[PDB]
Design a protein around this nucleic acid. Structure first.
Ligand SMILES: [Mg+2]
Ligand SMILES: [Mg+2]
Ligand SMILES: [Mg+2]
Ligand SMILES: [Mg+2]
Ligand SMILES: [Mg+2]
Ligand SMILES: [Mg+2]
Ligand SMILES: [Mg+2]
Ligand SMILES: [Mg+2]
Ligand SMILES: [Mg+2]
Ligand SMILES: [Mg+2]
Ligand SMILES: [Mg+2]
Ligand SMILES: [Mg+2]
Ligand SMILES: [Mg+2]
Ligand SMILES: [Mg+2]
Ligand SMILES: [Mg+2]
Ligand SMILES: [Mg+2]
Ligand SMILES: [Mg+2]
Ligand SMILES: [Mg+2]
Ligand SMILES: [Mg+2]
Ligand SMILES: [Mg+2]
Ligand SMILES: [Mg+2]
Ligand SMILES: [Mg+2]
Ligand SMILES: [Mg+2]
Ligand SMILES: [Mg+2]
Ligand SMILES: [Mg+2]
Ligand SMILES: [Mg+2]
Ligand SMILES: [Mg+2]
Ligand SMILES: [Mg+2]
Ligand SMILES: [Mg+2]
Ligand SMILES: [Mg+2]
Ligand SMILES: [Mg+2]
Ligand SMILES: [Mg+2]
Ligand SMILES: [Mg+2]
Ligand SMILES: [Mg+2]
Ligand SMILES: [Mg+2]
Ligand SMILES: [Mg+2]
Ligand SMILES: [Mg+2]
Ligand SMILES: [Mg+2]
Ligand SMILES: [Mg+2]
Ligand SMILES: [Mg+2]
Ligand SMILES: [Mg+2]
Ligand SMILES: [Mg+2]
Ligand SMILES: [Mg+2]
Ligand SMILES: [Mg+2]
Ligand SMILES: [Mg+2]
Ligand SMILES: [Mg+2]
Ligand SMILES: [Mg+2]
Ligand SMILES: [Mg+2]
Ligand SMILES: [Mg+2]
Ligand SMILES: [Mg+2]
Ligand SMILES: [Mg+2]
Ligand SMILES: [Mg+2]
Lengths: 122, 67, 130, 160, 200
RNA sequence: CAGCUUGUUGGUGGGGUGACGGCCUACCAAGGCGACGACGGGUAGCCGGCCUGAGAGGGUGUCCGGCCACACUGGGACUGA
RNA sequence: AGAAGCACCGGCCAACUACGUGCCAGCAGCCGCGGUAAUACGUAGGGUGCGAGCGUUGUCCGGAAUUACUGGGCGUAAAGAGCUCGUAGGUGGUUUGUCGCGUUGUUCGUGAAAUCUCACGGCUUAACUGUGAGCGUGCGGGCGAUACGGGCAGACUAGAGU
RNA sequence: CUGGGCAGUAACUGACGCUGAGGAGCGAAAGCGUGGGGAGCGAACAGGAUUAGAUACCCUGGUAGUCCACGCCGUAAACG
RNA sequence: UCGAAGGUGGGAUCGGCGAUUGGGACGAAGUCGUAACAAGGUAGCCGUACCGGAAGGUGCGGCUGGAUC
């Protein structure tokens, strides 16, 4: 509207918020994974989600999510972290890759056999 | 300016996006061997070698003198 | 009172919507030429110029089909004073995919899309009459 | 020997004294697949009665569409109460490109080459109403020739 | 890659047999799976996907090759589906199938891949080759008098010959007069749904 | 980020350059730039190109090609077309 | 005879049964499933799609007409400054003449190559590559027009003011 | 003492018009500074009453304020 | 003469930590009240001032986005 006013003040695209701040440019960031514990998700879920405090090589501390049936995690551990939303936990915005430098692939895994870590057979 | 004059020039260029025609005014420094020019005093200018640090124009003739 | 072409188009559109059989407005050469183009295109009936109290007034009579049907589907000014619209021969505007007529102001005078494309000279698209 | 497709099905609720009352409304589009298209809203307690009423209303509200050889003549831009859908003629090679409701209405009408997009609300009923409105403002070159005169100031390279 | 799997299972899934031959029918209805005898709501995307898969498994075309064929067809002027079908037909296996030098498309692909055809007296081993106008196709001289060819040498007179191709007698030579017209020869499938599928 | 500039703007006479030129020098005037954004802060090699988008547009400058800038950091001269 | 695997199967979107489990184990892009008959969890079978590749992550474009020239709105959903004056700026009544700056036409030069497209030619085909033409939206120069905007020179009263 | 508007004649000039970034002026009530004034009302405050409580609604009182002079403040559901 | 580096000095600008302290968002099934939605029990809002554990109350002026004869 008002081409003269548009000439005086052009349009501006919406502001953007980045979603990979902790990784800051890396699809996977190598972390430390200290103090593995378990918390409770939001009200209408009533579960016990296994989480951890992992500090990346980019020197940021975030709370990640551990997928699969159980884990071998412990105090500081040689782990890889990828992005992902949990939709139940307050502010967990990253997920640890299962089948990485330290953590093992989820045993007894036969379906989808790539996520959570699973060799075919050998 | 002691043998120099300052001349306002204007031009129109179409907007790259909106397409409206707009007018922009510029400013050039013109050499005046005999400094005879006042406020207004329309002048046609032809561009020369770098006569000075900021002078690239010279006086050609005086047309439509100031009212 | 800006863009008398737009005022003329708006008056014609309002009269056509209100089923008016007669319009009146002050006369200008541009409006007379536009009336000539409209008469040639067949969207309107006869037009004439009559001398009012001041200046001249241009008079356009409209046409209606068999029922209360309007030959003029609509009007749309194109080259507004806020942003002028210029078109060349290779990219002349199309109205209704050829079923509409756009007035083109070229060095040959006021011309329609097809006639202007025939002679290959473009200009300012005044409006779409379709 | 008609072609029918349902666009939207949903259940409405009205509060009564003792509890809840439900009903079903199912808009159904009916046509023969060549040039005829019908619109029926329909409403009943059960889905079969609802779609039957929609089919009947479409049969009642059948209306003529102008075609020029499988595609529309000139681009149109209709507008419903809230739906905003525009239709444009396309090359014969191109199929029918539209959303759910628009594509259903167009395929019941019998259009083979059309470019349709929705720009207003995403409600199925309003999209249908906008599409059928655009079909209504669609005119015929012969009709505009009757309106003006000299049926030569038109382009129909496909002809036939 | 190649399917190398049960063609009849694909035919039962697609609800339309498209291979024929000796194993045309299974003498049973089409419940392709455990729940295949149950009725399923027909979605708009389902019809287009089924049509595309029918064409791909009829012509032995991988997904990327079919994508390239469709994009070339739409980029070509005029129509899109007809051009796509013409490109699909222009394959060596399809040409051999139409000229009746093989039992089905899979047999034609097997022979052309094993390299028993010299088009202009030149060895080829790719079914992806496309024929053109004024192009000859000939049988390898050494490969004559072999069983897979002599089995059909005398019983190749059952299937019809398309109006664009022609066959030669005791010594078979395949020549291409012009581009095919699948719209008038052997079109068991409508391409106007594939053209809508590929524009999503 | 609302006031920026003093060889800074111009002129004169010399010097200097392959070459015009405050490029340098001695003297004279008070001028020059700024809301069409100077000055200041953040970021960045530019383009032909690449991706997406029907298009307009949005993102990007990696293969390759053209140019520019740099050679541990900072500064300088010479040889030589 | 020496050679296939991969992901998904609640709506978006193509793909359902059973077993164990019973807000626990768990999955998940949303909203939603799991608290004792789970097509949504792990598993088995079955199906779908692709394929020596299939899924996840990272970022950009599109859907988004949710920065709208194309292509948005501002009574009540977000949106008219509390009002007025006025600087720059944008915009402007009728008519005559001149210029031809904007406008537009032709011509010439330029707009490197590859790469984008048409048409062909060669690697058994394709990828890859060669050729002819488009592209290079533009710019500079000459030669045509004043229909509209505009510069100048005038005129009129309707606008406006007295 | 002074502003504006409307009507009439067309008497006069002759596009001198519209909007207006910034900028400037005006701008309810409440409030602030200086001096004056203060009948009535009336925040704050006090007593009584209601209530489990009543820092309120009700009653009895009562200070600034409401008023004037010159300044300041420039805010309202300043809304059609 | 100029001239890199270095020293001395007052400033300019951008960050990190900080005893202590203010407000905000979310949590559970806590404590104290019922301010709004009905005339919500004293109609509700808007600007300001004052007061009180808290929501809030009172005064001044305005609106109906309430009613009344
Ligand atoms: Mg707009
Ligand atoms: Mg000099
Ligand atoms: Mg919408
Ligand atoms: Mg491959
Ligand atoms: Mg000096
Ligand atoms: Mg000097
Ligand atoms: Mg850099
Ligand atoms: Mg778009
Ligand atoms: Mg360096
Ligand atoms: Mg080094
Ligand atoms: Mg160095
Ligand atoms: Mg040398
Ligand atoms: Mg030398
Ligand atoms: Mg499905
Ligand atoms: Mg169970
Ligand atoms: Mg499952
Ligand atoms: Mg997106
Ligand atoms: Mg967009
Ligand atoms: Mg909107
Ligand atoms: Mg509201
Ligand atoms: Mg609002
Ligand atoms: Mg106002
Ligand atoms: Mg306001
Ligand atoms: Mg306000
Ligand atoms: Mg002004
Ligand atoms: Mg003006
Ligand atoms: Mg004018
Ligand atoms: Mg003007
Ligand atoms: Mg070749
Ligand atoms: Mg080129
Ligand atoms: Mg030229
Ligand atoms: Mg008057
Ligand atoms: Mg006069
Ligand atoms: Mg004004
Ligand atoms: Mg202002
Ligand atoms: Mg007061
Ligand atoms: Mg006072
Ligand atoms: Mg006092
Ligand atoms: Mg008390
Ligand atoms: Mg009292
Ligand atoms: Mg009292
Ligand atoms: Mg006080
Ligand atoms: Mg004041
Ligand atoms: Mg008021
Ligand atoms: Mg602290
Ligand atoms: Mg209450
Ligand atoms: Mg209250
Ligand atoms: Mg009460
Ligand atoms: Mg109350
Ligand atoms: Mg009180
Ligand atoms: Mg108050
Ligand atoms: Mg009150």
């Amino acid at each position: 509207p008002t081409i003269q006013q548009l000439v005086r003040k052009g349009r501006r695209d919406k502001i953007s918020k980045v979603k990979t701040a902790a990784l800051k440019g890396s699809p996977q960031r190598r972390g430390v994974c200290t103090r593995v514990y378990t918390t409770t998700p939001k009200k209408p879920n009533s579960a016990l989600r296994k989480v951890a405090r992992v500090k990346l090589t980019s020197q940021v501390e975030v709370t990640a999510y551990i997928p699969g049936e159980g884990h071998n995690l412990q105090e500081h551990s040689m782990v890889l972290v990828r992005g992902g939303r949990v939709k139940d936990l307050p502010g967990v915005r990253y997920k640890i890759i299962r089948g990485s430098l330290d953590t093992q692939g989820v045993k007894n895994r036969k379906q989808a056999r790539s996520r959570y870590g699973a060799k075919k057979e050998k | 300016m002691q043998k120099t004059i300052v001349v306002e020039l204007e031009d129109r260029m179409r907007h790259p996006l909106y397409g409206k025609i707009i007018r922009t005014t510029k400013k050039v420094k013109a050499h005046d061997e005999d400094s005879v020019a006042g406020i207004g005093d329309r002048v046609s200018l032809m561009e020369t070698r770098p006569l000075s640090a900021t002078k690239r124009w010279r006086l050609v003739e005086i047309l439509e003198k100031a009212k | 009172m800006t863009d008398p072409i737009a005022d003329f188009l708006t008056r014609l559109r309002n009269a056509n919507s209100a089923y008016h059989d007669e319009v009146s407005l002050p006369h200008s050469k541009l409006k007379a030429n536009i009336a000539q183009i409209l008469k040639n295109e067949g969207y309107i009936s006869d037009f004439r110029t009559e001398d009012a109290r001041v200046g001249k007034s241009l008079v356009i009579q409209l046409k209606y089909g068999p029922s209360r049907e309007r030959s003029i589907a609509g009007l749309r000014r194109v080259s507004k004073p806020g942003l002028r619209v210029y078109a060349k021969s290779t990219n002349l505007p199309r109205v209704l995919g050829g079923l509409g007529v756009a007035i083109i102001s070229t060095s040959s005078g006021l011309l329609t899309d097809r006639q202007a494309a025939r002679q290959g000279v473009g200009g300012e698209v005044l409006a779409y009459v379709w | 020997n008609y072609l029918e497709r349902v666009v939207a099905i949903n259940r409405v609720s009205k509060v009564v004294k003792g509890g809840r009352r439900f009903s079903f409304t199912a808009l159904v589009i009916v046509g023969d697949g060549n040039g005829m298209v019908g619109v029926g809203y329909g409403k009943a307690k059960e889905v079969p009665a609802a779609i039957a009423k929609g089919v009947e209303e479409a049969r009642k509200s059948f209306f003529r569409v102008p075609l020029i050889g499988g595609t529309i003549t000139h681009p149109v831009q209709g507008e419903a109460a809230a739906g905003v859908v525009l239709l444009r003629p396309a090359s014969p090679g191109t199929g029918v490109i539209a959303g759910g409701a628009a594509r259903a209405v167009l395929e019941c009408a019998g259009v083979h080459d059309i470019l349709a997009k929705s720009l207003g609300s995403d409600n199925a009923i309003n999209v249908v109403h906008a599409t059928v409105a655009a079909l209504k403002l669609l005119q015929r070159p012969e009709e505009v020739a009757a309106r003006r005169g000299l049926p030569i100031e038109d382009v129909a390279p496909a002809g036939m | 890659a190649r399917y190398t799997g049960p063609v009849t299972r694909k035919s039962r899934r697609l609800r339309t047999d498209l291979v024929g031959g000796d194993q045309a029918f299974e003498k049973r209805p089409y419940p392709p799976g455990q729940h295949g005898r149950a009725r399923i709501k027909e979605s708009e995307y389902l019809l287009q996907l089924q049509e595309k898969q029918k064409a791909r498994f009829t012509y032995g075309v991988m997904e990327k090759q079919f994508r390239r064929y469709y994009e070339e067809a739409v980029r070509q002027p005029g129509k899109t589906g007809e051009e796509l079908l013409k490109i699909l037909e222009s394959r060596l296996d399809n040409v051999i199938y139409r000229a009746g030098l093989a039992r089905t498309r899979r047999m034609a692909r097997q022979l052309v891949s094993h390299g028993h055809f010299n088009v202009n007296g030149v060895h080829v081993n790719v079914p992806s080759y496309r024929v053109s106008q004024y192009d000859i196709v000939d049988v390898r001289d050494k490969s004559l008098n072999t069983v897979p060819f002599q089995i059909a040498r005398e019983t190749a007179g059952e299937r019809p010959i398309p109006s664009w191709l022609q066959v030669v007698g005791e010594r078979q030579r395949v020549l291409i007069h012009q581009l095919p017209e699948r719209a008038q020869i052997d079109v068991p499938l409508t391409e106007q749904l594939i053209v809508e599928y590929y524009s999503k």
